[PDB]
Every structure is written in C-alpha cells, then in structure tokens.
Amino acid sequence: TKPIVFSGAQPSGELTIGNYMGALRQWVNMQDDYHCIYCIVDQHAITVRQDPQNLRKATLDTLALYLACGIDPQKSTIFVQSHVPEHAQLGWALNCYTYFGELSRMTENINAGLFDYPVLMAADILLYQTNQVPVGEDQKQHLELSRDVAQRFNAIYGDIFKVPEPFIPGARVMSLLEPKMSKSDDNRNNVIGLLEDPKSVVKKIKRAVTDSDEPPVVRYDAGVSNLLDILSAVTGQSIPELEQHFGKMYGHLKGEVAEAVSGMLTELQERYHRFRNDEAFLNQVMKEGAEKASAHASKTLKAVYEAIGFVAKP
Amino acid sequence: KPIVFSGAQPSGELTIGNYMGALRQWVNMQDDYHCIYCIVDQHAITVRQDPQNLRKATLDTLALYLACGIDPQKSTIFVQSHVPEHAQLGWALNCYTYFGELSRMTQAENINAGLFDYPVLMAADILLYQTNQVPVGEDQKQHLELSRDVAQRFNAIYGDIFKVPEPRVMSLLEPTKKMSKSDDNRNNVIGLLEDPKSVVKKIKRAVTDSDEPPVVRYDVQNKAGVSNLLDILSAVTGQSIPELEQHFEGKMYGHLKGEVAEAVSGMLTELQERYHRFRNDEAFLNQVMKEGAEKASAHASKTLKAVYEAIGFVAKP
Ligand SMILES: [Ca+2]
Numbered sequence: 001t002k003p004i005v006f007s008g009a010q011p012s013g014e015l016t017i018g019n020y021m022g023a024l025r026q027w028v029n030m031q032d033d034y035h036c037i038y039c040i041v042d043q044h045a046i047t048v049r050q051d052p053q054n055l056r057k058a059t060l061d062t063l064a065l066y067l068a069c070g071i072d073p074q075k076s077t078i079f080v081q082s083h084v085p086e087h088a089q090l091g092w093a094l095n096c097y098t099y100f101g102e103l104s105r106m107t108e109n110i111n112a113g114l115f116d117y118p119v120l121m122a123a124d125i126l127l128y129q130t131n132q133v134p135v136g137e138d139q140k141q142h143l144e145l146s147r148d149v150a151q152r153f154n155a156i157y158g159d160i161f162k163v164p165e166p167f168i169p170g171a172r173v174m175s176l177l178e179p180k181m182s183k184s185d186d187n188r189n190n191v192i193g194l195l196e197d198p199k200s201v202v203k204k205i206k207r208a209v210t211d212s213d214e215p216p217v218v219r220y221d222a223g224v225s226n227l228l229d230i231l232s233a234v235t236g237q238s239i240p241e242l243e244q245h246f247g248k249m250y251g252h253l254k255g256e257v258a259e260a261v262s263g264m265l266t267e268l269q270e271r272y273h274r275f276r277n278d279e280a281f282l283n284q285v286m287k288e289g290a291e292k293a294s295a296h297a298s299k300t301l302k303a304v305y306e307a308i309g310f311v312a313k314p
Numbered sequence: 315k316p317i318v319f320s321g322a323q324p325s326g327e328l329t330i331g332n333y334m335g336a337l338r339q340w341v342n343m344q345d346d347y348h349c350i351y352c353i354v355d356q357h358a359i360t361v362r363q364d365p366q367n368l369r370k371a372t373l374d375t376l377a378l379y380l381a382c383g384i385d386p387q388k389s390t391i392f393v394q395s396h397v398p399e400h401a402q403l404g405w406a407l408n409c410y411t412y413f414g415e416l417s418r419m420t421q422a423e424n425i426n427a428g429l430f431d432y433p434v435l436m437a438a439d440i441l442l443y444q445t446n447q448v449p450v451g452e453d454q455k456q457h458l459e460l461s462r463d464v465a466q467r468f469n470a471i472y473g474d475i476f477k478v479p480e481p482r483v484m485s486l487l488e489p490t491k492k493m494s495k496s497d498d499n500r501n502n503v504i505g506l507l508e509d510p511k512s513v514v515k516k517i518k519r520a521v522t523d524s525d526e527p528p529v530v531r532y533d534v535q536n537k538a539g540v541s542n543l544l545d546i547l548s549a550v551t552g553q554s555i556p557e558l559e560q561h562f563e564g565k566m567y568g569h570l571k572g573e574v575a576e577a578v579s580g581m582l583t584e585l586q587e588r589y590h591r592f593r594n595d596e597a598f599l600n601q602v603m604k605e606g607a608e609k610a611s612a613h614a615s616k617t618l619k620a621v622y623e624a625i626g627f628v629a630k631p
Pocket residue numbers: 072073074075
C-alpha cells in the first residue's frame with residue numbers, strides 16, 4: 001500500500017502552465033509511487049450560486065483535462081464528489097466534532113455552506129486515510145482544521161483517521177506582466193491557460209514584461225528570467241545551454257518560448273477534445289472512479305459510525 | 315395519500331403524555347396516510363453520546379414504536395443514518411440557507427457546528443419524502459417554518475422540486491406544567507417503560523387539593539391536581555370526563571388514584587409485553603431496519619436526484 005495523496009479540483013478551476021509544469025506533470029509520473037486521489041468538488045462549488053448548465057459543463061471540462069494531462073483512472077482514483085455519498089455523510093458527522101468558533105475564525109447574509117464547507121473539506125481528506133495533501137497557501141488554515149479534527153476524534157475513539165500532512169514540491173513559472181503565476185490571478189494576462197489557443201499564447205508572451213538593458217542580453221536574474229524558466233521547463237534544456245542559442249534579441253526569445261509552449265499545449269489539447277467529446281467514455285470514467293472511491297471511503301465511514309455508536313446498517 | 319414525516323429521538327423514554335396525545339393518535343391513521351417515522355440518530359450526536367448507549371437507545375426506540383403499533387408494512391420506519399440521502403441533501407440545503415436564519419434559531423458553551431446546523435438537516439429529512447405534513451410540537455415550530463422557507467426558496471429558483479410542508483397529561487407533582495422527560499424530579503413523569511408498581515406509587519403520591527370534604531370534579535383553575543388525574547383517566551379508558559364525575563360522586567381522592575394507577579398500569583403492561591418481545595428479537599429489528607431503509611432510500615433518491623439535476627451536478631452514472 002502506497003502513501004495516499006488527496007487533491008481537490010474546482011470544477012470552474014482553470015489550470016495554468018504553472019499548475020502543469022510545476023506540479024501536475026510530475027504527479028502524473030508518480031502515480032505508481034503514490035495512490036493519488038483527485039476529487040472534483042462540485043458540492044463545494046455550489047456554496048456560490050451556479051448556473052446549472054455551466055456547472056455541469058465545467059465538471060466534465062475538468063475531468064477531461066485531468067485525463068488529458070495523464071491521470072489514469074485505474075492507477076489513480078478520479079471522481080466527482082457528489083457521486084460518493086460518503087463525503088456528505090462524514091461531513092455531517094464531523095460537524096459534531098468541529099467547534100463553531102473554529103469555523104468563525106475561517107470567516108450575516110452568507111449561506112450556511114460557505115460557513116460550513118471547511119468541515120466538508122476535512123471529510124473529503126479523512127475519508128480516504130489520506131497521508132499527504134497538496135495545499136495552496138490560501139488553504140493552509142483549512143488543512144490545519146482537518147488535522148485538529150482528526151486528532152480530536154482519535155483522542156476520543158481511537159486511531160480511526162490518519163492525521164494528514166501538507167506536501168511540498170518543481171518548475172518555477174512567474175506571472176508574465178508581473179514576474180508567481182497563479183490560477184487565482186485577478187489579472188488574466190499574467191497567466192497562460194492549458195486550453196489557450198496558440199494566437200493568445202503568442203500575444204501574452206510577446207507582451208510579457210522585460211527589462212530594458214542596453215544592449216538587451218539573455219541572462220537569469222525578472223521578465224527575461226521568467227521566459228528562461230518557462231522555456232527550460234518545456235524543452236528540458238539547461239538555462240545556460242538556452243542562452244548559448246540566444247546575439248538574438250528579446251524578440252527571438254519571446255518567439256521561441258511561444259512556439260514551445262504552444263507545441264506542448266497542442267498535444268494536451270487534442271487529448272482534451274478527444275476525451276471531452278466522448279461523453280460515453282467520461283460516464284464510464286466517473287462510474288469507475290465513484291465506485292472505487294466509495295469502496296475505499298465506506299471502510300472509514302463504517303468505522304466512524306461504529307465508534308460513534310450508530311446501529312450498523314443491516 | 316398524504317405523506318406525514320415524524321422524527322423520533324433515539325432515547326427510548328417516551329412519556330405517557332407523548333403516547334396518549336401524539337403517537338397513539340397516529341397509529342390509527344396508518345391506513346389513511348403514508349406515515350414515515352425516522353429515528354434521528356444523526357441529530358442525536360449533536361450532543362456527545364456514550365457509543366454503546368446510543369446503539370442501545372436506537373433499538374429501544376424502534377422496539378418501542380413497534381410495540382405502540384407502528385406497522386412496518388403500512389408505514390416506513392427506519393434509522394436516519396441508514397439512508398445516506400439525508401446527509402447528502404443536508405449539505406446541499408446548507409447552500410440555500412442563510413447563516414442568519416440559523417443564528418436566529420434560539421434552540422451553551424463551546425457549541426459544535428452540528429448543534430448550529432441541525433435545522434438544515436431537519437429540513438433535508440422532511441423534504442426528501444415529498445412530505446405534506448409534519449406534526450411538530452410548539453418548540454419545533456421555528457424549525458418547521460425554516461424548512462418551509464427553504465423549500466419555497468429552492469422552488470423559486472429551480473421550479474417545484476420540493477413539496478412545501480404545511481404550516482394532555484401534566485406532571486404528577488406539578489400539574490401546571492406538562493409531563494416532561496427533562497423534569498429533574500423524576501416522580502413527575504410516567505414512562506411507557508416504567509415498572510407497573512413504580513407507576514402506581516407515583517400516581518398514589520400525585521398532588522391533589524385540600525377541599526373539605528374532597529370533591530372529584532374537573533376544574534383546572536382551582537383543583538389542578540384532581541383535574542390532571544381525570545384527564546389521564548379519560549385518556550387511557552376513553553370515558554368522557556363527566557362520566558367520571560358521576561362515577562366518583564361521593565368517592566375520595568384515594569379511590570381516583572387507585573383507578574388511574576390500575577388503568578395506566580394495564581395500558582403499560584400490554585405495551586411493555588409487546589416491547590420486550592420485539593426488543594429481545596434483534597433479528598426481527600434488523601430486518602425491519604433493512605426493509606425500512608430500502609423503502610426510505612427508494613423514495614429519497616428520487617427527490618435527491620431531481621435536486622442534483624436542477625442544481626447542475628452531473629448525474630451519477
Ligand atoms: Ca490505465
């Protein structure tokens with residue numbers, strides 16, 4: 001049994017080139033070393049009012065994109081959250097072991113889902129005996145609540161849950177017009193999406209901030225440096241060996257980058273469309289993932305219900 | 315047939331006031347209504363429980379409702395935790411409930427989130443079954459009204475997915491307050507599973523008045539103690555109260571206490587005979603919980619899948 005890694009994927013989330021070359025490209029190559037779990041959290045998504053048609057479409061978009069990146073439905077467990085009842089069941093039970101004050105510290109006319117979703121996050125992770133969690137900086141507090149709830153529950157009932165640990169990377173990709181590239185960027189021009197057409201990549205790379213050194217030379221030190229990090233990650237080349245290739249101006253660099261990133265995204269995107277348009281295949285993937293997820297999750301939930309004192313479902 | 319939903323705490327301490335008033339009445343209407351009795355063990359854990367006692371009290375409650383006459387073939391009786399759709403809809407309805415609506419729910423220390431959020435789960439329990447009517451007490455009126463508001467709010471967004479639900483024994487030593495399981499002095503309370511000799515003793519010590527000479531006459535204002543014993547006697551036996559005023563003309567209070575104790579005791583001995591039979595047959599209780607949970611899930615899943623389709627979730631394949 002390998003270490004279990006759990007990651008949540010927002011249905012509306014837009015994966016950037018930073019998300020891919022930095023983290024997800026490595027995670028794909030390590031699916032034989034870890035039991036990786038990817039949960040498309042549509043129950044977390046409806047804490048914000050959602051257009052139903054866009055929610056359904058975005059869930060399928062996200063599934064197809066992760067499959068396009070190489071997530072293997074048989075090696076890993078990839079599923080839609082609402083297809084696995086155990087998430088809501090454990091979410092309710094852990095409400096009774098979470099303090100109202102803890103949720104208040106997470107930050108009226110908000111809905112109860114926004115207030116309570118940190119408990120559902122804890123259930124998402126603890127269901128699968130998760131060992132490690134890749135947490136963004138924005139999610140640090142949520143992960144520490146999951147640890148505190150797991151320890152509190154185990155102190156009462158015994159070692160039912162594993163106490164999850166945050167996990168660390170690692171290609172560095174910086175925001176183009178402000179050299180870290182983030183999927184949360186309020187400025188779209190700072191990032192390149194995985195579903196970005198070649199023309200828009202060319203336009204964002206050409207417009208990337210750079211330093212007006214005279215004469216313009218290619219050297220790692222913040223604009224020019226970003227393009228060296230991005231190009232090196234795509235081509236697997238050393239930064240200095242790249243500088244050997246560039247006498248050329250910053251326009252040579254920006255052109256070279258844009259061509260490489262678009263070459264890599266094109267291979268990802270054709271896989272994306274082949275999976276995305278095959279709705280029957282996606283239904284099979286969600287069925288396999290949900291059934292595998294529930295089999296694993298029910299082992300933990302039934303031990304939780306046993307310890308709480310519920311009559312076991314006959 | 316109209317659908318009626320009632321939640322039963324897994325406590326196993328029904329009082330004779332609860333039975334004669336509420337539960338006994340519903341037992342006779344199982345042919346005219348689709349009655350749903352849900353033993354709400356997920357609500358119970360909003361207060362920390364001893365694990366073994368919770369399990370025992372859930373089976374105690376089931377056996378007790380069975381002995382009172384709830385028929386698992388006419389009605390649907392099940393344990394809440396056996397039907398995952400309750401928690402599933404509970405989470406979804408959180409997103410359509412305002413924080414302030416739960417904050418204004420009066421019914422502390424370091425409260426846990428379940429104690430705050432359980433009114434949402436109550437709404438989920440009711441709405442899963444297209445429920446028409448919920449027989450709540452006065453102290454759960456707010457909870458029912460919140461369930462109605464959430465159903466209306468959801469329907470106003472997505473269309474009519476939910477049905478909107480529709481909008482006397484006293485303490486023996488304190489006959490101006492209704493018989494309460496929470497009473498600190500347990501000699502105020504008669505439970506359905508109270509030993510007959512114990513029930514007769516408490517009835518014998520029930521408060522009365524100081525009329526010289528004693529008079530047995532229904533006047534709640536001046537003779538609360540005697541009027542209470544006449545309501546209990548009228549409830550067990552069905553005799554109209556003026557009949558007992560005529561039967562006790564010239565009789566003393568001790569005669570009436572002997573009459574209430576005997577009648578109450580007889581009712582509790584038939585109920586307890588059935589209870590111990592059901593409760594000692596755990597295989598029978600398991601099969602009732604299995605069947606009840608399958609029926610409950612069959613109806614609940616229809617509503618939950620319609621809710622998920624309106625919200626925009628991908629349908630589970
Ligand atoms: Ca495979």
